Amino acid sequence: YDIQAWKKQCEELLNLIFQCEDSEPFRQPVDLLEYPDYRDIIDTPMDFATVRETLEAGNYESPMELCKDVRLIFSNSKAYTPSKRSRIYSMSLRLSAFFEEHISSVLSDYKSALRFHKR
Ligand SMILES: OC1CN(C(c2ccccc2)c2ccccc2)C1
């Protein structure tokens, strides 16, 4: 029932995501010189360095907020891909499955801790 435990759990999951070769296209903001039309399609860029920095700044109040930003990395990849068979998008799908598999217990434990706090 530790209400704060999610933070270190998210730091550890971000460390694993950074070791994953599938995260390379998503570690830093999409290069606007490489993809000059990016901002015509994507309204809110997001990347894993921005997520890690937001967490370390103490600017996430819950793991649900972190999850919303990580899911935005994947929805941006899906919205920008010219094809559902493209390399970068294909990497995003594997990384998303890995993320969802690991974040589920982080979210469940946090929500359970908050419910216990208000028991
Ligand atoms: O609390 C976290 C910060 N995330 C938002 C956000 C992302 C970038 C800049 C400002 C704010 C957001 C995510 C996805 C859609 C729209 C906004 C949710």
UniProtKB/Swiss-Prot annotation:
It is found in: Nucleus. It is linked to Chung-Jansen syndrome: An autosomal dominant disorder characterized by developmental delay, intellectual disability, autistic features, anxiety, hypotonia, obesity, and dysmorphic features. Interacts with IRS1 and IRS2. Interacts (via bromo domain) with acetylated lysine residues on histone H1.4, histone H3 and H4 (in vitro). Residues 1-106 form the Bromo domain. The chain holds residues 1316 to 1434 of 1821 of the full protein. Expressed in myeloma and epidermoid carcinoma cell lines. The modification Phosphoserine is found at S90. This is PH-interacting protein. The lineage of its organism: Eukaryota, Metazoa, Chordata, Craniata, Vertebrata. It comes from Homo sapiens (Human). Probable regulator of the insulin and insulin-like growth factor signaling pathways. Stimulates cell proliferation through regulation of cyclin transcription and has an anti-apoptotic activity through AKT1 phosphorylation and activation. Plays a role in the regulation of cell morphology and cytoskeletal organization. The modification Phosphothreonine is found at T44.
